[PDB]
């Protein structure tokens, strides 16, 4: 019921840039083996047990968030549905400590190694300790994403990867048929560690004759002038072929090679919007060759006839067409060799980003042929990160300034903003911001307007505000930016409001470094428009840096505000003939109709140990049976995924059967699947299937191990059309039921443990439908962990920990420093502390002893 | 765009047929403004729209301008031409347009008639060709080149250069419109005397800008030494030099930028030295705005990068200092009606309006965009212009009767520049004045801000005041005054001596600017 606190360490995850995944096309054998060695002297650090886990993540876990997470702290591996792990005897996926049996049941001790192998044709991960096999695997999991080798850790640990390319000395022999970072790793980049976040047509005949004859003369002239003389020996290194003579005696497949290539070329060009006809048609026949000495007429006998274009360029318009042709040729080369044929022989890599050098080499090889053909006369035509100072540092009056530096020249916005900056809104799209985006040289407030010159590399930009005369000024390397109308930063008459706050926003792949003035040396220029104008560097008189809150991307849960524009809920009191109901409404007008929105109830349903072992969904008789069941504690939240179909919608009712308690979701408009979901469900959107994974695959020697269970059932919900089969608009009463115990009943009696004997359903004010907001706020910690050869070994020595709240209702942790602007949980926790002090009254020491469990001496000292 | 071009051809024959031997007259007059307004307004149609036919249709519109040759009217039909001159600014396969070849006649027709009408006879003038100013402007938006960029028109500079000297004839009709014809060498290649004189290679091969890597520079070498050599007082020895000097100076800037960079600075310093001719108070009011507006561009010719500009600024400030005694004539007339004010009003108006039109613009063009950086970096960058040149602002700040100078701004086409004269220098002139970064000047400025007399303020300035309070001056002031002060100056009189200038600025300039 209350918020409990304790000291939590910082868990950090690292991962090499190794891309492995499944798709229709390039696969790279999809099977990979991996080895890592550990060295540490901190089996039990002074704080708590250290963290060290190894596994894979499908490029969407986003686990490393220094601070609180879904469970207790930002756990990196195996504490969600998107990661898998092993720590010596464990199988972690979604905060579950699944045990395994293996000889020498010890943790990842020093001077030891672990091996991880991944099969993708059949989805499976297996682990192996230094010498012995492990009796547990993961399987039957989603593959929609790239699987990345990851490792989580705490301080005091040195860890070395094993690549095998240059210094990976595998102490354990590789398993039979797994690539040890050999075939294709960083094909277009390097390797480095990276923390996460019978009558043919005449036209065709003419084109074929031109292209084929010209290119066949080409190869001969090119080789014979390079010096490819008639050698007697048959060499394979240089691949000189003395039997290879002029075009006439080319092998039999040469005819089809010539025909099909030009056929595909013309078919592709037909869809490029070309224009057939005569444009020049002169250099082919009326060509007048300039005086060329006969020295170039070497004993080959074949006259070289290249078009003289030492200064003439045809067109940059053909560049895109040649690029498309080169892409198609690269695709068919991939088909021939690796990416589409999957030939097992011995190289190459996926066709998407195989190699820029190889792509440009192929482009140059195929560009000159088209250039010569055309010169003969046939001329032819995922979000944004926002950062701000906390509401504590809100500036109310005065003249203030701070600087910023843009390492890149991409998408960035810098300026001021109101303290109540609502996220999910681009800067300058409302009254709540006054920002500048120099990518196109624009100012932003209630929209975009032209203002100033665009950035360059670095390009330090300073931002100042003067509340005395209600102005905002932008300077660029010591000169004020100018508007199109010649005004001096025209922002007259800006309301003071509740103060102002610095704000920055960066797009994808953008790097910025802003200084609030904590130390005046870090101010890059600060010598022109800040000194004698009286402007105050923002964070000038402070001995500690600024908190600098930022914008999270993980979609946490929040109640629907009653003032929502077009999402209005209702709480009807239960009548005589019907229990209380919860209806929703939508503005069936020119308003937005967003994707299916996931709704959730406030209280959870912990399960003992079993005792229900299943759940049943039904309209009036047995619907889709074998609904996924778990049988452990597994806190469970009533859920509802509905789409706005105009008019009205759900009605998450509260029903009560003759001797059971069923929750009902009435519906009238159209299809909306409505069954509850887990408490840890925080996915994106745009997806209905393949969001559950990680079935436990521990077994026994002779395939007799009976410890297989389809756990991690995040989306423990059904779908609508399973129940009805008709083409009409009737009403539907889906009544799922999970709870049932000795009644000698309803949903309300299973969540408050105070009316458990009461059979009457109730809807107290605690109940409230929620919804997951795409973006919330989070606090950047004031400190971070410190962390290069022989597999890029990395060490972390300096310890670091934090104290954070944990909400029992949602079983989630949250850094306690957030209360400083939460401002409500802060008041509740202050009153909780007062209650503790009161109940430990004067001279009552047994209660003090009892409280010494809820709080700790180290916690109080911290 | 071509749907409405047919109506143009029907009226030209009927106009002469009816007179020499109607609804049609208005049927051409009406489309003029309608087409011209949108054509000038939607100038962004060029690049993202009308990918290939834009050139052809603009060329057809240009070829429609041949009507001026047939029907020469003394009365202007500007309602179309003024806005149609702006359509000129609005891949090797571009043979569709045929007036790409008529461009030669379009260029030659205007300039060929000046030789015919050199007599210029009772009232006849160059009004037919005077409109070429808009057409001659081709700085950036070049669609087609066709090698017909400067081969022919370069022959027409000599007809213009024939009227360089006065030659005891009536003044030039279009000296300003003569200069626009000189583009800043933006023809993608150039070499002198090969097409001008050698016709043997012109028709055969255009081999230029690559073979003569050191022979391309032959016109600037003769055009740079001579005008710098002349430094005469009167404007007659430069009879057309104001109209002929800006274009060669501008052209050499872009040329050989990646290879030869000293030409720009050489030309800039040469013109800066030549400005000693303009330095005197009043010699020719006609030449003052023309030379200033022709080329107010400075690349590497500021006081800090070029120490010669430091010396030139001394002469400029010396010229400026005379303005106090110059404006004292106003007080002479205002001293209890000492003499009739009419004889002095005109002199004061001229001496206040004309001289300030050039010097203030010169610094604010690009010199005030570079000097304050060095001045902030070190106090010795422009200490001469810091401890001085403040007296110029005082004359205009006081003597409010001089606000009539706004008549000078009136002829340009009220945010008068008088308030903004030290605006660029408001961070440079008083930065090295008193307590550079100490904040101790706040008390002195507050004490002096009582509309006190100059003598009384000077007497009060002898007291001296400082403050080492635990105030805001912890880490901005007294922490960046010291590193910024290379040689810590300790002189109360020398600092208050610039402090009263700031106090007077507070009392007069911005205090009135806010009311104004």
Determine contact: B433 vs chain A, CB below 8 A.
no
Tell me the C-alpha distance between A42 and A155, whole Å.
9
Q: Of B61, B206, B57, whose CA–CA distance to B146 is shortest?
A: B206
The answer to whether B92 contacts A315, with C-beta atoms less than 8 Å apart, is yes
Contact at 8 Å (CB) between A243 and A251?
no
Chain-centre distance for alpha carbon B391: 26
Our CA angle for B201, B203, B205, nearest 5°, is 60
For A548-578, b/e burial (b = at least 16 CB within 10 A) is bbebbbbbbbeebeeeeeebebeeeeeeeee
- Categorise residue A837: left if φ over 0, alpha if ψ from -120 to 50, beta otherwise: alpha
* Residue of A485, A532, A538, A542 for testing the chain B interface, max B β-carbons within 10 Å: A532
Tell me the C-alpha distance between B165 and B172, whole Å.
10
To the nearest 5 percent, what fractions of chain B are helix, strand and coil?
55, 0, 45
Of A478, A533, A537, nearest to B373 by CB-CB distance is A478
CA distance B373 to chain A (A): 7
Residues 6+ apart with CB under 8 A from B445: B499, B502, B503, B506
* Residue of A528, A534, A543 for testing the chain B interface, max B β-carbons within 10 Å: A528
Residue A612 structure tokens: 């229900």
Of B369, B437, B475, nearest to A540 by CB-CB distance is B475
Considering only residues 170 to 229 of chain B, which have any Cβ-Cβ distance to chain A shorter than 8 Å? none
- Looking only at Cα atoms, what is the longest distance across chain B? 98
Tell me the C-alpha distance between A37 and A169, whole Å.
11
For B1-32, b/e burial (b = at least 16 CB within 10 A) is beeeeeeeeebeeebeeeeeeeeeeeebeeeb
Determine contact: B92 vs chain A, CB below 8 A.
yes
Q: Of B154, B192, B92, B94, whose CA–CA distance to A311 is shortest?
A: B92
Our CA angle for A329, A330, A334, nearest 5°, is 115
The answer to whether B437 contacts A531, with C-beta atoms less than 8 Å apart, is yes
Residue A476 structure tokens: 């660029």
The answer to whether B369 contacts A479, with C-beta atoms less than 8 Å apart, is yes
For A797-820, b/e burial (b = at least 16 CB within 10 A) is eebbbbebbbeeebbbbbbbbbbe
Of B92, B377, B472, nearest to A314 by CB-CB distance is B92
- Phi, psi angles (nearest 5°) of residue A528: -120, -60
- Phi, psi angles (nearest 5°) of residue A553: -120, -20
Please, what sign has the CA dihedral across residues B14, B16, B17, B18? positive
Residues 6+ apart with CB under 8 A from B80: B32, B33, B35, B36
- Closest Cα in chain A to B435: A532
3-state SS assignment for residue A197: coil
Contact at 8 Å (CB) between B72 and B128?
yes
Residue B396 structure tokens: 């205009």
Q: Of A403, A400, A430, whose CA–CA distance to A414 is shortest?
A: A403
DSSP-derived secondary structure letter, A561: P
Which DSSP string do the residues of A453-499 spell out, in sequence order?
----SEEEEEEEEETTTTEEEEEETTEE--BTT--SS---S---TT-
The answer to whether A316 contacts B92, with C-beta atoms less than 8 Å apart, is no
The answer to whether A531 contacts B480, with C-beta atoms less than 8 Å apart, is yes
* Residue of A531, A533, A540 for testing the chain B interface, max B β-carbons within 10 Å: A531
3-state SS assignment for residue A133: strand
B93 CB neighbours in chain A (<8 A) are 279, 315, 379, 381
- Closest Cα in chain B to A279: B93
- Closest Cα in chain B to A378: B93
Tell me the C-alpha distance between A392 and A549, whole Å.
11
Our CA angle for A780, A785, A791, nearest 5°, is 130
Residue A482 structure tokens: 């100018």
Contact at 8 Å (CB) between A170 and A164?
yes
Residue B51 structure tokens: 């990918």
Tell me the C-alpha distance between A35 and A117, whole Å.
9
3-state SS assignment for residue B385: helix
3-state SS assignment for residue A312: coil
Chain-centre distance for alpha carbon A16: 16
- Categorise residue A680: left if φ over 0, alpha if ψ from -120 to 50, beta otherwise: alpha
Element containing residue A404 per DSSP (H, E): strand A399-406
DSSP-derived secondary structure letter, B363: I
CA distance B457 to chain A (A): 23
DSSP-derived secondary structure letter, A695: E
- Closest Cα in chain B to A540: B475
Tell me the C-alpha distance between B29 and B73, whole Å.
15
B91 CB neighbours in chain A (<8 A) are 315-317
The answer to whether A532 contacts B430, with C-beta atoms less than 8 Å apart, is yes
Q: Of A593, A152, A143, A685, whose CA–CA distance to A382 is shortest?
A: A685
Residue holding tokens 């696969």?
A27
CA distance A606 to chain B (A): 58
Tell me the C-alpha distance between A347 and A344, whole Å.
11
The answer to whether A381 contacts B93, with C-beta atoms less than 8 Å apart, is yes
Chain-centre distance for alpha carbon B320: 21
CA distance A529 to chain B (A): 8
Contact at 8 Å (CB) between A718 and A738?
no
In sequence order, the β-bridge partners of residue A777 are A551
Residue A699 structure tokens: 């077994």
In sequence order, the β-bridge partners of residue A480 are A475
Our CA angle for B329, B332, B335, nearest 5°, is 150
Residue holding tokens 């029992």?
A808
Tell me the C-alpha distance between A671 and A191, whole Å.
49
Resolution of this model in Å is: 3.4
CA distance B91 to chain A (A): 5
Tell me the C-alpha distance between A353 and A188, whole Å.
7
Chains A, B: CB contacts within 8 A come to 39
Contact at 8 Å (CB) between A171 and A157?
no
Of A316, A527, A540, nearest to B377 by CB-CB distance is A527
CB atoms within 10 A of CB A734: 23
A314 CB neighbours in chain B (<8 A) are 92
Tell me the C-alpha distance between A260 and A694, whole Å.
47
For helices B219-229 and B262-274, give the axis angle rounded to 10 degrees: 20
List the end-to-end C-alpha distance of chain A, in Å, as a whole number. Answer: 24
Contact at 8 Å (CB) between A163 and A191?
yes
The answer to whether A529 contacts B377, with C-beta atoms less than 8 Å apart, is no
Please, what sign has the CA dihedral across residues A15, A18, A19, A20? negative
Contact at 8 Å (CB) between A676 and A716?
yes
Tell me the C-alpha distance between A493 and B60, whole Å.
50
Q: Of A298, A362, A370, whose CA–CA distance to A328 is shortest?
A: A362
CA distance A526 to chain B (A): 10
For A615-632, b/e burial (b = at least 16 CB within 10 A) is bbbbeeeebeeebebbee
Considering only residues 344 to 373 of chain B, which have any Cβ-Cβ distance to chain A shorter than 8 Å? 369, 372-373
* Chain gaps in chain B, named by the residue before each (C–N > 2.5 Å): 21, 90, 120, 205, 413
The answer to whether B476 contacts A540, with C-beta atoms less than 8 Å apart, is yes
Q: Of A2, A4, A1, whose CA–CA distance to A814 is shortest?
A: A4
- Phi, psi angles (nearest 5°) of residue A812: -130, 150
Residues 6+ apart with CB under 8 A from B342: none
Q: Distances in Å between the alpha carbon of B170 and those of A145, A204, B119, B238, B290? A: 84, 72, 10, 15, 19
- Phi, psi angles (nearest 5°) of residue A636: -130, 135
How deeply is A485 buried, as exposed, middle or buried, from its count of CB atoms within 10 A (0-12, 13-18, 19+)?
Answer: exposed
Tell me the C-alpha distance between A480 and A461, whole Å.
10
CB atoms within 10 A of CB A362: 16
Residue A662 structure tokens: 């069923």
Q: Distances in Å between the alpha carbon of B43 and those of A562, B47, B88, B386? A: 50, 9, 10, 46
3-state SS assignment for residue A216: helix
């Amino acid at each position: 019921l209350l918020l409990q606190t304790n000291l939590i360490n910082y868990v950090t995850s690292i991962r090499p840039n190794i891309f492995v995944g499944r798709a229709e096309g390039s696969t790279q054998y999809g099977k990979w083996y991996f080895e890592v060695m550990v060295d540490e002297v901190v089996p039990f650090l002074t704080a708590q047990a250290t963290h060290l886990r190894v596994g894979w993540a499908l490029t969407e876990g986003y686990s490393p968030y220094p601070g609180g997470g879904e469970g207790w702290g930002g756990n990196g591996v195996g504490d969600d549905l998107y990661s898998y792990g092993f720590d010596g005897l464990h199988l972690w996926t979604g905060h579950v400590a699944r045990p395994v049996t293996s000889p020498g049941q010890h943790l990842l001790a020093p001077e030891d190694v672990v091996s991880c192998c991944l099969d993708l044709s059949v989805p499976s991960i297996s682990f192996r300790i230094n010498g012995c096999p492990v009796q547990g695997v993961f399987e039957a999991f989603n593959l929609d994403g790239l699987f990345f080798p990851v490792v989580s850790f705490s301080a005091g640990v040195k860890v070395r990867f094993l690549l095998g390319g240059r210094h990976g000395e595998f102490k354990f022999l590789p398993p039979p048929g797994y690539a040890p970072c050999h075939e294709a790793v960083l094909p277009r980049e390097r390797l480095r560690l990276e923390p996460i976040k019978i009558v043919l047509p005449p036209h065709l005949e003419r084109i074929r004759e031109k292209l084929a004859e010209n290119i066949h003369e080409l190869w001969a002239l090119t080789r014979i002038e390079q010096g490819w003389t008639y050698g007697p020996v048959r060499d394979d290194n240089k691949r000189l072929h003395p039997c290879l003579v002029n075009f006439h005696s080319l092998p039999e497949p040469e005819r089809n090679y010539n025909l099909q290539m030009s056929g595909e070329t013309l078919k592709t060009l037909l869809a490029l919007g070309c224009h057939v006809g005569m444009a020049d048609e002169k250099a082919e026949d009326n060509l007048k060759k300039t005086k060329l000495p006969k020295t170039y007429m070497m004993s080959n006998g074949y006259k070289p006839a290249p078009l003289d274009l030492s200064h003439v360029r045809l067109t940059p318009a053909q560049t895109t067409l040649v690029d498309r042709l080169a892409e198609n040729g690269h695709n068919v080369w991939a088909r021939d060799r690796v990416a589409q044929g999957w030939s097992y022989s011995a190289r190459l890599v996926p066709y998407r980003l195989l190699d820029e050098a190889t792509k440009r080499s192929n482009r140059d090889s195929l560009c000159q042929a088209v250039r010569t053909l055309l010169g003969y006369g046939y001329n032819i035509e995922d979000r944004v990160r926002i950062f701000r100072a906390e509401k504590s540092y809100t500036v109310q009056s005065g003249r203030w300034y701070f600087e910023f530096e843009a390492v890149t020249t991409g998408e960035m916005r810098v300026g001021w903003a109101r303290p109540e900056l609502r996220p999910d809104v681009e800067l300058g799209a409302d009254e709540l911001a006054y920002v500048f985006n120099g990518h196109r040289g624009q100012r932003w407030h209630l929209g975009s307007e032209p203002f100033g010159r665009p950035w360059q590399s670095g390009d330090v930009v300073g931002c100042m505000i003067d509340l005395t005369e209600n102005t905002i000024i932008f300077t660029l390397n010591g000169e004020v930016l100018m508007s199109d109308s010649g005004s001096e930063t025209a922002f007259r008459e800006i309301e003071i409001g509740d103060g102002f706050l610095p704000v920055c926003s960066l797009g994808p792949g953008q790097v910025g470094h802003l200084n609030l003035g904590q130390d005046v040396s870090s101010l890059r220029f600060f010598a022109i428009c800040g000194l004698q104008e009286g402007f105050e560097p923002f964070a000038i008189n402070m001995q500690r840096p600024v908190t600098t809150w930022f914008s999270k991307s993980l979609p946490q849960f929040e109640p629907v505000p009653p003032e929502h524009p077009h999402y209005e809920v209702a709480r009807m009191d239960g009548t005589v003939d019907t229990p209380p109901c919860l209806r929703l409404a939508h503005r069936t007008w020119g308003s937005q109709n967003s994707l299916v929105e996931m709704l959730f109830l406030r209280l959870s349903l912990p399960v003992q140990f079993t005792t229900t072992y299943y759940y049943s969904v039904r309209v009036f008789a047995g619907q889709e049976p074998s609904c996924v069941w778990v049988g452990w504690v597994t806190p469970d939240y009533h859920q509802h995924d509905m789409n706005f179909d105009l008019s009205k919608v759900r009605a998450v009712t509260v029903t009560m059967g003759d001797e059971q308690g069923n929750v009902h979701s009435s519906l009238k408009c159209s299809n909306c699947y409505m069954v509850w979901g887990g408490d840890f469900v925080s996915p994106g959107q745009q997806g209905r299937i393949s969001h559950t994974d990680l079935v436990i695959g521990c077994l026994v020697d002779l395939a007799t191990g009976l410890m297989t269970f389809t756990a991690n059932g995040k989306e423990s919900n059904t779908f609508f059309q399973v129940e009805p089969n008709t083409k009409l608009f009737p009403a539907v009463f889906v009544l799922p039921t999970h709870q049932n115990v000795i009644q000698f009943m309803p949903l309300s009696a299973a969540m408050f443990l105070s009316e458990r004997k009461n059979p009457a359903p109730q809807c107290p004010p605690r109940l409230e439908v929620q919804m997951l907001m795409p973006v919330s706020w989070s606090r950047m910690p004031n400190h971070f962990l410190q962390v290069e050869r022989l597999g890029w070994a990395v060490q972390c020595q300096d310890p670091l920990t934090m104290m954070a709240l944990h909400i029992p209702e949602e079983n989630r942790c949250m850094d306690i420093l957030e209360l400083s602007e939460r401002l409500d949980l802060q008041r509740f926790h202050s009153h909780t502390l007062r209650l503790y002090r009161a109940v430990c009254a004067l001279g009552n020491n047994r209660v003090a002893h009892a409280l010494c469990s809820h709080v700790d001496q180290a916690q109080l000292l911290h | 765009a071509f749907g409405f071009l047919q109506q143009l051809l029907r009226w030209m024959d009927i106009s002469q047929e009816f007179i020499a031997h109607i609804k049609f007259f208005a049927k051409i007059l009406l489309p003029l403004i309608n087409q011209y307004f949108t054509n000038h307004c939607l100038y962004f149609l060029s690049t993202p729209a009308k990918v290939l036919g834009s050139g052809g249709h603009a060329s057809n519109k240009e070829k429609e301008m041949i009507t001026s040759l047939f029907c020469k009217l003394a009365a202007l039909v500007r309602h179309r031409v003024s806005l149609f001159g702006t359509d000129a600014p609005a891949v090797a396969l571009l043979p569709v347009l045929t007036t790409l070849f008529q461009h030669i006649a379009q260029h030659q027709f205007g300039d060929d008639v000046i030789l015919d009408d050199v007599q210029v006879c009772s009232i006849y003038s160059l009004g037919t060709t005077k409109n070429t100013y808009v057409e001659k402007l081709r700085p950036a938006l070049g669609e087609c080149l066709a090698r017909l960029a400067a081969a022919m028109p370069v022959a027409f500079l000599e007809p213009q250069l024939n009227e360089y000297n006065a030659c005891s004839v009536y003044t030039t009709k279009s000296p300003r419109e003569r200069a626009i014809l000189g583009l800043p060498n933006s023809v993608e290649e150039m070499c002198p005397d090969i097409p001008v004189l050698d016709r043997l290679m012109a028709d055969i091969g255009a081999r230029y800008t690559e073979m003569p890597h050191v022979i391309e520079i032959t016109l600037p070498m003769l055009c740079s030494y001579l005008p710098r050599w002349w430094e005469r007082g009167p404007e007659a020895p430069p009879p057309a030099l104001p109209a002929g000097a800006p274009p060669p100076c501008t052209a050499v800037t872009s040329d050989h930028l990646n290879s030869l960079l000293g030409n720009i600075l050489r030309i800039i310093v040469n013109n800066l030295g030549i400005d000693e001719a303009t330095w005197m108070k009043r010699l020719a009011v006609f030449a003052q705005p023309i030379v200033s507006r022709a080329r107010p561009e400075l690349l590497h010719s500021h006081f800090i990068p070029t120490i010669g500009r430091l010396r030139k600024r001394a002469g400029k400030v010396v010229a400026e200092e005379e303005q106090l005694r110059l404006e004292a004539k106003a007080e002479a007339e205002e001293g209890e009606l000492l003499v009739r004010d009419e004889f002095s009003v005109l002199c004061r108006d001229l001496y206040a309006l004309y001289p300030l039109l050039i010097r203030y613009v010169d610094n604010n063009r690009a010199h005030w965009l570079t000097e304050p950086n060095a001045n902030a970096e070190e106090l010795f960058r422009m200490v001469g212009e810091i401890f001085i040149y403040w007296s110029k602002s005082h004359n205009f700040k006081r003597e409010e009767q001089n606000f009539v100078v706004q008549n000078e701004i009136n002829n340009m086409s009220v945010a008068t520049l008088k308030k903004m004269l030290p605006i660029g220098l408001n961070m440079c002139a008083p930065t090295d004045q008193d307590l550079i970064m100490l904040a101790k000047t706040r008390y002195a400025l507050k004490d002096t801000d009582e509309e006190v007399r100059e003598f009384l303020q000077n007497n009060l300035h002898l007291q001296g005041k400082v403050e080492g309070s635990p105030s805001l001056r912890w880490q901005m002031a007294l922490y960046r005054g010291l590193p910024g002060r290379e040689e810590d100056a300790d002189d109360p009189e020398k600092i208050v001596r610039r402090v009263q200038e700031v106090s007077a600025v507070l009392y007069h300039l911005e205090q009135t600017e806010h009311p104004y």
